[PDB]
Enzyme design. Structure first.
Site, PDB file in Angstrom:
ATOM      1  CG  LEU A 197      -2.041  -1.089   1.192  1.00 40.11           C
ATOM      2  CD1 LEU A 197      -2.888  -0.863   2.283  1.00 40.11           C
ATOM      3  CD2 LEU A 197      -2.822  -1.056  -0.173  1.00 40.11           C
ATOM      4  N   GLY A 198       1.937   1.207   0.816  1.00 37.89           N
ATOM      5  CA  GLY A 198       2.807   2.332   0.680  1.00 37.89           C
ATOM      6  C   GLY A 198       4.209   2.161   1.470  1.00 37.89           C
ATOM      7  CD  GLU A 199       8.542   1.893  -0.620  1.00 33.05           C
ATOM      8  OE1 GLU A 199       9.139   3.030  -0.869  1.00 33.05           O
ATOM      9  OE2 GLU A 199       8.757   0.538  -1.041  1.00 33.05           O
ATOM     10  N   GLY A 200       6.902   4.933   3.800  1.00 39.02           N
ATOM     11  CA  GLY A 200       7.055   6.286   4.488  1.00 39.02           C
ATOM     12  C   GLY A 200       7.973   6.235   5.698  1.00 39.02           C
ATOM     13  CD  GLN A 201       5.977  10.200   8.523  1.00 38.02           C
ATOM     14  OE1 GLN A 201       5.735  11.132   9.193  1.00 38.02           O
ATOM     15  NE2 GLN A 201       4.999   9.086   8.251  1.00 38.02           N
ATOM     16  N   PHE A 202       6.956   5.570   9.149  1.00 30.16           N
ATOM     17  CA  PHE A 202       6.727   4.368   9.702  1.00 30.16           C
ATOM     18  C   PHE A 202       6.714   3.054   8.952  1.00 30.16           C
ATOM     19  CB  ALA A 203       7.046  -0.027   9.097  1.00 31.31           C
ATOM     20  CB  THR A 204       6.196  -1.052   3.959  1.00 31.01           C
ATOM     21  OG1 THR A 204       6.361  -2.429   4.483  1.00 31.01           O
ATOM     22  CG2 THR A 204       7.198  -0.580   3.224  1.00 31.01           C
ATOM     23  CG  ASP A 231       0.051  15.625  11.244  1.00 34.03           C
ATOM     24  OD1 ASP A 231       0.126  16.950  10.784  1.00 34.03           O
ATOM     25  OD2 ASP A 231       0.223  14.724  10.919  1.00 34.03           O
TER      26      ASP A 231
HETATM   27  C1  LIG Z   1      -7.754   3.067  -6.179  1.00 31.94           C
HETATM   28  C2  LIG Z   1      -6.516   3.653  -5.516  1.00 31.94           C
HETATM   29  C3  LIG Z   1      -6.458   3.508  -3.950  1.00 31.94           C
HETATM   30  O1  LIG Z   1      -7.490   3.595  -3.394  1.00 31.94           O
HETATM   31  N1  LIG Z   1      -5.306   3.302  -3.335  1.00 31.94           N
HETATM   32  C4  LIG Z   1      -4.974   3.258  -2.001  1.00 31.94           C
HETATM   33  C5  LIG Z   1      -5.908   2.026  -1.254  1.00 31.94           C
HETATM   34  C6  LIG Z   1      -5.700   1.999   0.188  1.00 31.94           C
HETATM   35  C7  LIG Z   1      -4.586   2.561   0.673  1.00 31.94           C
HETATM   36  C8  LIG Z   1      -4.112   2.596   2.173  1.00 31.94           C
HETATM   37  O2  LIG Z   1      -3.015   2.768   2.458  1.00 31.94           O
HETATM   38  N2  LIG Z   1      -5.219   1.977   3.045  1.00 31.94           N
HETATM   39  C9  LIG Z   1      -5.085   1.852   4.351  1.00 31.94           C
HETATM   40  N3  LIG Z   1      -5.942   1.049   5.156  1.00 31.94           N
HETATM   41  N4  LIG Z   1      -5.639   1.266   6.343  1.00 31.94           N
HETATM   42  C10 LIG Z   1      -4.528   2.384   6.600  1.00 31.94           C
HETATM   43  C11 LIG Z   1      -4.560   2.603   5.257  1.00 31.94           C
HETATM   44  C12 LIG Z   1      -3.246   3.750   5.460  1.00 31.94           C
HETATM   45  N5  LIG Z   1      -2.850   3.854   6.666  1.00 31.94           N
HETATM   46  C13 LIG Z   1      -1.939   4.737   7.276  1.00 31.94           C
HETATM   47  O3  LIG Z   1      -1.828   4.797   8.372  1.00 31.94           O
HETATM   48  N6  LIG Z   1      -1.564   5.577   6.452  1.00 31.94           N
HETATM   49  C14 LIG Z   1      -0.440   6.849   6.770  1.00 31.94           C
HETATM   50  C15 LIG Z   1      -0.427   7.802   5.759  1.00 31.94           C
HETATM   51  N7  LIG Z   1      -1.144   9.042   6.676  1.00 31.94           N
HETATM   52  C16 LIG Z   1      -0.481  10.225   6.126  1.00 31.94           C
HETATM   53  C17 LIG Z   1      -2.628   9.209   6.494  1.00 31.94           C
HETATM   54  C18 LIG Z   1       0.825   6.206   7.121  1.00 31.94           C
HETATM   55  C19 LIG Z   1       1.563   5.241   6.341  1.00 31.94           C
HETATM   56  C20 LIG Z   1       2.894   4.955   6.759  1.00 31.94           C
HETATM   57  C21 LIG Z   1       3.481   5.657   7.535  1.00 31.94           C
HETATM   58  C22 LIG Z   1       3.069   6.556   8.334  1.00 31.94           C
HETATM   59  C23 LIG Z   1       1.565   6.918   7.943  1.00 31.94           C
HETATM   60  C24 LIG Z   1      -3.992   2.988   7.429  1.00 31.94           C
HETATM   61  C25 LIG Z   1      -2.853   1.987   8.208  1.00 31.94           C
HETATM   62  C26 LIG Z   1      -4.588   3.662   8.392  1.00 31.94           C
HETATM   63  C27 LIG Z   1      -3.947   3.691  -0.110  1.00 31.94           C
HETATM   64  C28 LIG Z   1      -4.122   3.740  -1.307  1.00 31.94           C
END
Ligand SMILES: *CCC(=O)Nc1ccc(C(=O)Nc2n[nH]c3c2CN(C(=O)N[C@H](CN(C)C)c2ccccc2)C3(C)C)cc1
Length: 276
Positions: free
Chosen positions: A9-16, A111
């Site tokens: 789903l993504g990379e960032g500060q805290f882990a993937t 935040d």
């Molecule tokens: C069609 C394209 C689309 O919708 N893509 C997509 C789907 C789903 C995600 C996603 O990350 N989903 C998700 N489900 N639970 C969580 C996430 C993201 N997430 C975070 O905590 N994310 C934060 C980002 N902040 C700035 C909101 C994060 C991630 C890594 C490190 C620090 C902070 C949780 C776990 C709540 C993405 C795209």
């Protein structure tokens, strides 16, 4: 191991982050350190429909939250969508209800910004990223005038100003006060809303870094938010008051006629879901 990953789903500060089906329940989840192990403590504590659920956590750690399809920044950024008064109302209701809960539990988020206001497939908005959150015991553009000055005695008004900033961005579809230094942010607040006097603010000069700014009158809110009615202008007016004691609380915002007037909030199922 109670989960096995499916999609990155993504990379960032805290882990993937990693999308997973939980082996036992078949439910789909997302799977993420003193600055994080207080966040782990704080979030397993709480339960609200409008707050991200920390379901499990288990130093190299991985933290199972709810899976969220999208966020408000995507919705804001998305030109294929038109936001109607009823989408905006539903969005601000869930935001403020989630906030009211946190503030009755003597927590500040600190935040609030639209990329943290996540949404599920069934149109339920949940506040995310409690890495800056603190008990009563943000990026420049959603940051309150007092914080830009330098207040360390500060309250709920910090989170309430950001809600105004997010609300404006729901309406205009662009950041309201997009500064490129902490002084340019005060320059932008004071040309758009007018320079506050010490009749607009009782103990302002007692701030360590209060500064004598150009005396602007500001733009009237009806010129900025031309499509907003008097009920929503009063909501926006309340959120953007410079005195953090005058500034409206999540509770006063939610008892505001705006949320009881027509058109009502859109059901989640009918909130505008985007594509990737
Ligand atoms: C069609 C394209 C689309 O919708 N893509 C997509 C789907 C789903 C995600 C996603 O990350 N989903 C998700 N489900 N639970 C969580 C996430 C993201 N997430 C975070 O905590 N994310 C934060 C980002 N902040 C700035 C909101 C994060 C991630 C890594 C490190 C620090 C902070 C949780 C776990 C709540 C993405 C795209």
């Amino acid at each position: 191991k109670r989960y096995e990953k499916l999609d990155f789903l993504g990379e960032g500060q805290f882990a993937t982050v990693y999308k997973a089906r939980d082996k036992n329940t078949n439910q789909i989840v997302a799977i993420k350190n003193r600055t994080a192990l207080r966040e782990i403590k704080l979030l397993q504590e709480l339960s609200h429909p409008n707050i991200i659920g920390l379901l499990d956590a288990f130093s190299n750690i991985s933290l199972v939250f709810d899976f969220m399809e999208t966020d408000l920044e995507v919705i804001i950024k998305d030109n294929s969508l038109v936001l109607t008064p009823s989408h905006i109302k539903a969005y601000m209701l869930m935001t403020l209800q989630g906030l009211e809960y946190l503030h009755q539990h003597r927590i500040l988020h600190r935040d609030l910004k639209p990329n943290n206001l996540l949404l599920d497939e069934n149109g339920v908005l949940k506040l995310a990223d409690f890495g800056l959150a603190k008990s009563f015991g943000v990026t420049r553009w959603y940051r309150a005038p007092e914080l830009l000055f330098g207040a360390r005695m500060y309250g709920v008004g910090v989170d309430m100003w950001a809600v105004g900033c997010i609300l404006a961005e729901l309406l205009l579809r662009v950041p309201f006060l997009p500064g490129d230094s902490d002084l340019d942010q005060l320059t932008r607040i004071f040309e758009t809303l007018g320079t506050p006097t010490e009749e607009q603010w009782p103990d302002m000069c007692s701030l360590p870094d209060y500064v004598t700014f150009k005396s602007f009158p500001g733009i009237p809110l009806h010129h900025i938010f031309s499509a907003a009615g008097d009920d929503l202008l009063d909501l926006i007016q309340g959120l953007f008051l410079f005195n953090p004691c005058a500034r409206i609380t999540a509770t006063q915002a939610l008892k505001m006629k705006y949320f009881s007037n027509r058109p009502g909030p859109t059901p989640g199922c009918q909130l505008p879901r985007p594509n990737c």
